[PDB]
């Protein structure tokens, strides 16, 4: 019956680790969206984009055009 006690010791350690993993994922997620928001600002504010189009060789950047940030309901 000690095997059943070792399974309990194993599952606790596995749950120690998955909780630590969850926090890391939660933490890196928060960084990315800020990075996404910051990169939208550095790049979009020849003048071709994915926002406007590429064929310029023949109106401004509203926050309604932040299509990458607006793809997350958290933002």
């Amino acid at each position: 019956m000690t095997d059943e006690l070792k399974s309990y010791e194993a599952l606790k350690a596995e749950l120690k680790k998955s909780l630590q993993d969850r926090r890391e994922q939660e933490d890196t997620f928060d960084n990315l969206q800020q990075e996404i928001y910051d990169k939208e600002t550095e790049y979009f504010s020849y003048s071709g984009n994915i926002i406007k189009g590429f064929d310029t060789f023949s109106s401004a950047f509203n926050n309604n055009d932040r299509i990458f940030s607006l793809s997350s309901a958290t933002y």
Binding site: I36, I50, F54, F68
Partner: protein, 297 residues
């Protein structure tokens, strides 16, 4: 009027008429195996479809087994083998054989009997968009299984990679593929469209299609096109900023997938511990069985 007989002929209509008279295609019968060949679902999206991939992007492997390839797989390679060769895997090998010979022996039909041997070809088979798919998988930091897009069926995931399929089955399959190329005298094994050779002009052959007679000539100068190279460089930059954000979004959803894969695992661990905790009458131990509150903006 009626029943005046001076040769009244009746016509049944395997070729219809509609009302000059107009011929009409007759109603089309249905195909029995339709439900076996057309299996799946396409979900309509709220907004109108935006799409620009080509047929080639959506077809997967170039090679398609015919009836003769089918019998050879079952009654020779997979007859009693311990290790069986998947149809998808058989095509992966042949698709690589065709690409290799097309590159190393482009004029095979000049001397079909002198087609490369398997051992002579094996080096080139190794060097053979797999690389880009793997490069993206690393940049996302997914580093798990395969990189999945809309252009991928789920049945291709259970197929072995090419480099190991060479070792396990390569010599046996190539010897069969080699004989097919020999029978067709170095030409294409399967029916191709008939095209006009560049610089040549054919007019009589009825099977010549989709001619392209336009020709572009270089400008009579050695100078550098400064203008069209600045704008090419500018476009190259905007495509690089393009890729940076798309990568982030693919990173964001990847961690969002890891997070929930954790939650689904944390849950399944908490319930197993509890069912295990009650069997051993162990008390306390509730710190990691409940979610706590930390800081998140």
């Amino acid at each position: 009027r009626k029943i005046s007989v001076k040769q009244h002929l009746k016509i049944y209509l395997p070729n219809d008429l509609k009302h000059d008279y107009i011929p009409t295609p007759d109603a089309s019968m249905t195909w029995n195996e339709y439900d076996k060949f057309y299996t799946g679902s396409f979900q309509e999206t709220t907004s109108y479809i935006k799409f620009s991939a080509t047929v080639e992007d959506c077809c997967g492997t170039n090679y398609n087994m015919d009836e003769r390839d089918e019998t050879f797989l079952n009654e020779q390679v997979n007859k009693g083998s311990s290790d069986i060769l998947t149809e998808d895997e058989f095509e992966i090998l042949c698709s690589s054989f065709e690409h290799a010979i097309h590159e190393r022996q482009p004029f095979l039909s000049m001397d079909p009997e002198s087609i490369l041997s398997f051992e002579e070809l094996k080096p080139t088979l190794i060097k053979s968009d797999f690389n880009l798919r793997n490069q993206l998988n690393h940049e996302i930091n997914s580093h798990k299984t395969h990189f999945i897009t809309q252009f991928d069926p789920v049945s291709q995931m259970n197929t072995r990679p090419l480099i190991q399929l060479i070792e396990k089955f390569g010599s046996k399959i190539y010897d069969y593929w080699r004989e097919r190329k020999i029978e067709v005298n170095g030409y294409e094994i399967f029916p191709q469209l008939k095209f006009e050779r560049p610089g040549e002009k054919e007019e009589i052959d009825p099977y010549v299609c989709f001619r392209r007679r336009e020709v572009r000539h270089p400008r009579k100068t050695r100078r550098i096109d400064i203008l069209n190279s600045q704008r090419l460089r500018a476009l190259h930059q905007e495509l690089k900023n393009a890729k940076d954000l798309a990568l982030l979004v693919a990173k964001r959803e990847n961690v969002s997938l890891n997070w929930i894969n954790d939650e689904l695992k944390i849950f399944d661990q908490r319930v197993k511990i509890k069912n295990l905790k009650r069997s051993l009458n162990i008390s306390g131990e509730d710190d990691d069985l409940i979610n706590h509150k930390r800081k998140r903006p």
